[PDB]
Amino acid sequence: MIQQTGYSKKVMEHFMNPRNVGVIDDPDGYGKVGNPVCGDLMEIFIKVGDEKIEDIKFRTFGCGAAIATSSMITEMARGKSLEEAMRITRNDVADALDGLPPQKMACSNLAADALHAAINDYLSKKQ
Amino acid sequence: MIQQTGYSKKVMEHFMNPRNVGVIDDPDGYGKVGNPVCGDLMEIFIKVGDEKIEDIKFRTFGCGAAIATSSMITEMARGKSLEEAMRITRNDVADALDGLPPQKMACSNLAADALHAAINDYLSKKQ
Ligand code: FES
Ligand code: FES
Structure with missing residues (x-):
């Protein structure tokens, strides 16, 4: 078939066994972004110690591509400085996402x- | 707030720990339905013995409401006759779904x- 799309092993691994699902109570930074098409919401919670991500959790009721990408992005953010985590985007897990249906590019950008957003929330509370 | 919506404990239980996720190889009946808005696909696989559902599995990369509703519907279908399973609809788990965002009514109907569709696939193979 032409323009074939579908789901890779790595996305299926992170959708079936996502890392860092949950909530942090009283977090240092909280960010939430929604997807305009389906209305699902991605929420990220961070604890910050030493200017670094000491803990991170995500919560969403969105689709498999959004949950797998959040699992991969939160795992990559853990332990990074705030400035390094600010540079993280789904480009950093491009190979795992290649091939996904084209509408899931937006779902992949939520994490x-x-x-x-959570990092900026924490910084704006510093001031 | 007015017209409040969100996610209940029962849906959160079935989204976090869905029952009957997987595939049946060489199934007796296979059904697949898609959601027009997001393009996600719900696939149900059944094994039929004694005119009854001897095993059922679902596979989707759709959202939390579609995965929780499939978990609840496949659990209710297991062991039922084909005619009884044909009567099952999300109405049978209405109370667990009440309150969900209104766009997830379509996601809830996929299972x-x-x-x-899987039952009709199996019946059309009988003939
Ligand atoms: S379809 Fe809602 S987050 Fe992907
Ligand atoms: S948003 Fe795709 S199945 Fe619900």
Whole structure:
């Protein structure tokens, strides 16, 4: 078939066994981003110690591509400085996502956009 | 707030720990239904013995409401006669779903529509 799309092993691994699902109570930074098409919401929670991500959790009721990408992005963010985590985007897990249905590119961008939002929330509370 | 919506404990239980996720190889009936808005696909697989559902599995990369509803519908279908399973719809788990965002009503209908499709696939193979 032409323009074939579908789901890779790595996305299926992170959708079936996502890392860092949950909530942090009273988090240092909280970010939430929604997807305009389906209305699902991605929420990222961070604890910050030493200017670094000491803990991270995500919560969403969105689709498999959004959950797998959040699992991969939160795992890559853990332990990074705030400036390094701000540079993380789904480009950093491009190979795992290649091939996905084209509408899931937006779903894949929720995790990094919520992480950036959580970092900015924490920074704006510093001031 | 007015017209409040969100996710209940029962849906969160079935999204976090869905029952009957997987595939049956060489199934007796296979049904697949898609959601027009997001393009996700729900697939149900059944094994039929004694005119009854001897095993059932679903596979989707759709959202939390579609995965929780499939978990609840496949659990209710297991062991039922084909005629009883044909009567199952998300109405049978209405109370667990009440309150969900209104766009997830379509996501909630995928499981029973795929189950009906799998049953009709098996019947059309009888003939
Ligand atoms: S379909 Fe809602 S987050 Fe992907
Ligand atoms: S948003 Fe795709 S199945 Fe619900």
